Ligand binder design. Structure first.
Ligand SMILES: C[S@@+](CC[C@H](N)C(=O)[O-])C[C@H]1O[C@@H](n2cnc3c(N)ncnc32)[C@H](O)[C@@H]1O
Ligand SMILES: Cn1cnc(S(N)(=O)=O)c1
Ligand SMILES: Cn1cnc(S(N)(=O)=O)c1
Ligand SMILES: [Zn+2]
Ligand SMILES: [Zn+2]
Ligand SMILES: [Zn+2]
Length: 426
């Protein structure tokens, strides 16, 4: 039976609340997307269908835009790719924004597909659009997306009879803005974007009681605190490494609301997050625009070069608890891992451990994965007691945030068994 239910909140629209008492780690809901696509930077790097990486991908012969890890993935993707294929080819040199490709797949799914389990609690039709809070500047952007959609889809959609009844493209893009989910791979790299309308019932908190995690395109929703009957379920929409000012801007611009939580009222952790010399971390924050762009396109050697110029700068440096320094350390660690520079990766990774303990309180999947990566690096460098401690810590977090239904837990159990065997052998 469902442990969760839709309800009408007092001042944040519809929400989701507990039907039964919930414990940390409890699986509350799981969902495939209504529609999803690979994101800009990962196109051609990960499989369109399973969103896993591969050194060589197979391309769709007709459009040569969709790329796949296997014949299986290519063929199972064909029903949901068939109609967009004509459009991606027709516009051969042009590639549409991710949101436009996403909405194309929404339309095809709603027109040609059976009703999706993803809409069990809440449908695309039901989604919040915030249209009466949009600024004129945002409306202008949405009008351009509508015209972009109309151009991209012209081979397949010519009139309203090819859209769902009373479907309004402007309203649909407004819904996409404030209900899109960023799909992350097992290493927490962003790889795609999707709509999960039942999961869109969850309202935001800067200190939430639930968490979502992705296993390929599949989404698991779990409790990460004790929750009482009738209590609202919340997730954090945002990266934890953000000041209250940064959160204010994104929640206004993307979600059209003002956050009243205790953390925003008190600027909780802002001061620690911005320690060090302001001129230095303003330069690092600016450099992170390019670093994060490079990372999104998997350009690890270039990422590492930029990060080393900051971490080992001849000029003034920042404390590791400064969030921009911390982001650079994380990017450098992931770059070193993907480049096989495991000694250097462990150095950066170990430095992030205490800041992550502070900025990801309780059970958060980003910290669980980070601790796992550090433990794995220590295990393969022969540091068995230290690896075991971190792998056990990762398990303590990821049993709650990931659970047995997530394949990464199985990978972690293997590392724990390996590390334990090494300790028993003395
Ligand atoms: C993904 S939807 C969540 C469900 C939404 N309340 C609904 O009725 O469909 C996101 C929208 O919910 C609203 N909202 C979400 N979290 C909120 C919060 N803490 N405080 C106030 N409004 C919130 C905002 O309108 C936001 O744009
Ligand atoms: C109840 N309600 C739903 N949506 C709103 S809105 N569009 O954010 O003003 C209010
Ligand atoms: C509907 N929604 C938008 N973003 C999210 S989140 N928490 O960032 O996955 C949920
Ligand atoms: Zn695949
Ligand atoms: Zn194709
Ligand atoms: Zn808040």
């Amino acid at each position: 039976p469902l442990k969760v239910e839709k309800f009408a909140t007092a001042n944040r629209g519809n929400g989701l609340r507990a039907v039964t008492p919930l414990r940390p780690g409890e699986l509350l809901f799981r969902s495939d997307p209504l529609a999803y696509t690979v994101c800009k930077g990962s196109r051609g790097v990960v499989c369109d269908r399973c969103l896993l990486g591969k050194e060589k991908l197979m391309r769709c012969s007709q459009c040569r835009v969709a790329k796949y890890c296997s014949a299986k993935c290519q063929k199972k993707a064909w029903p949901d790719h068939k109609r967009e294929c004509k459009c991606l080819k027709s516009c051969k040199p042009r590639y549409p924004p991710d949101s436009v490709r996403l909405l194309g797949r929404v339309v095809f799914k709603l027109m040609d597909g059976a009703p999706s389990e993803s809409e069990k609690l809440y449908s695309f039709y039901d989604l919040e659009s915030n249209i009466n809070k949009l600024t004129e500047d945002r409306k202008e952007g949405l009008r351009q997306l509508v015209m972009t959609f109309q151009h991209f889809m012209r081979e397949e959609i010519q009139d309203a009879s090819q859209l769902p009844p009373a479907f309004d493209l402007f309203e649909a893009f407004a819904k996409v803005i404030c209900n899109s989910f960023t799909i992350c791979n097992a290493e927490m790299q962003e790889v795609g974007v999707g709509l999960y309308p039942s999961i869109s019932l969850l309202n935001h908190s800067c200190d939430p009681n639930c968490s979502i995690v992705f296993n390929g395109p599949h989404l698991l929703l779990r409790a990460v605190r004790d929750i009482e009957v009738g209590e609202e379920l919340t997730i954090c929409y945002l990266d934890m490494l953000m000041t209250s000012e940064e959160r204010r801007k994104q929640l206004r611009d993307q979600y059209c609301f003002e956050c009243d939580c205790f953390r925003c009222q008190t600027q909780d952790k802002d001061a620690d997050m911005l320690t060090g010399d302001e001129q230095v971390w303003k330069e690092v924050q600016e450099s992170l625009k390019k670093i994060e762009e490079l990372k999104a396109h998997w350009k690890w050697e270039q990422v590492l070069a930029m990060c080393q110029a900051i971490i080992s700068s001849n000029s003034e440096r920042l404390p590791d608890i400064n969030i921009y320094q911390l982001k650079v350390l994380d990017c450098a660690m992931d770059a070193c891992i993907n480049l096989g520079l495991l000694e250097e990766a462990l150095f950066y990774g170990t430095r992030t451990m205490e800041p992550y303990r502070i900025f990801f309180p309780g059970s958060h999947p980003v910290r669980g994965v980070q601790v796992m990566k550090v433990g794995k690096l220590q295990l393969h460098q022969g540091m068995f007691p230290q690896a075991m401690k971190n792998l056990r810590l990762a398990f303590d977090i990821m049993r709650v945030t990931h659970g047995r239904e997530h394949s990464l837990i199985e990978d972690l159990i293997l590392l724990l068994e390996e590390c334990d065997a090494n300790i028993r052998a003395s």
